[PDB]
Amino acid sequence: NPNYSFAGKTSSISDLKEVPRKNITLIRGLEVYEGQVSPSPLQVAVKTLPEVCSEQDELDFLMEALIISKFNHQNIVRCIGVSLQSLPRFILLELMAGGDLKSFLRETRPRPSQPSSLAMLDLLHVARDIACGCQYLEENHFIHRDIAARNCLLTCPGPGRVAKIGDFGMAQDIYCAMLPVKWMPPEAFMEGIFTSKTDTWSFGVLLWEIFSLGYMPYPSKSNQEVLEFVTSGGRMDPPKNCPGPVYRIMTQCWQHQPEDRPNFAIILERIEYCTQDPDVINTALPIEYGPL
Template sequence: MKDFQHPHILGLLGVCFDTPDNSPYIILPFMANGSVKTFLRAKRVHPTNFDDFPVGLTFGDLVRMCMEIAEGMKYLTDNKFVHRDLAARNCMVNEEGMVLVGDFGLARDVYNIEYYRSGGNTRLPVKWMPPETMNDGISNEKTDVWSYGVTCWEVFSLGRNPYPGIENHEILQHISSGGRLKKPTLCPDKLYTLLLQCWSSLPEDRPSFTELWVLLKEYWDEEHLYVVQSFQVQ
């Protein structure tokens, strides 16, 4: 992590070994707004309202968050790094509202319920994993892209847990039989189609993070053009 230098990657400031319990403490930049998951949940109009835009955020803001995550993931991919645990809980929001991809295996105890123990002591984030990872332990850019699609679903669901009503041990059968996350109310059809591409059963049919960033940038530009045109009409 010490080599990561990117505005959308949570870098490492240092490691402290002089600690009360003699365990090394990792020093990271302070993220005033916590994780994307907790940030969006706190912004909901009502705790159970997933269908209205959150307080102080627009569609363009949600797209920007997804775009910033894609940009950070592109950087990791370009540096031959596979995240393996991309999720809204592991993306952080700073004081200015900018999203930084983080965790890299550091916060699993915090969201222990979202990891499934399939055997032994290993816990796996199965609701964010593609079938080839669950079946064969494969990890690469395209498996991270699958997780990215789930992360974007979390963004447009305002921090909901994916696959509500489906237990962790049922996930592999669900996605292997063609089951996918349903379209969130706040997610337009065009963008949901992109998420479905991220969840293609064939890894080679999934877009790259570069392609994802370009497409999201187009959506973001369209939203800002619409806002400007509306302002000019008024």
């Protein structure tokens, strides 16, 4: 019966909104499923706990539910509720029909078949959306410890999409071959120290992911190669066609000392300035060659 504290308030399993299992219908796989909760039922994403799981997996599933349920921000995926009293156990989330941001960027790259699928403003809007969520976490003293394109989701694929932070596993914090080293600042991988300025660093890496249209950070480098590179002052080059003003946000996010990195209010200010600049937003994204 673990307690969870966020923004000075403590909650437990009893605070989670239990939805009767009979009101929940699974529609398709997306494990995660599209579902409906009951003339116009609510469309949801359903995250499931495998019945064949360990006891730690059970506790981790509960904690995930507690964490997400206590956030209240338009750029953090909503929790509709849970169904923990039937098996397999469910967490019911906001349906994000656009899927994860990394997959979206890769699949929606400008190609000859789709020459204007995305523009710079689309990318700056995604960046602003996630920075807004990050500012909310910072203001509420929550350290994400796992900001990355794979952990962000889109409301829909088409125009008007809103990006949100969707996953809260805190993968960077060991307090390893699964460690997301490519998103971690020096103090995190060396000393295991995390603060809101460690989220700033990771946001810089996300910005690179966005403006590269979904490339893996540090092209051709392994995890240890990246660790040694970043420790010695090495930084990524700009993504292809990346405007100078946008690259400078990245390089500010990657200052060696945490105190020299911007907070999320400043990041948002800088993203807004880029969004206003015609030379930035009139920059064409590269076209990835393919058939008509």
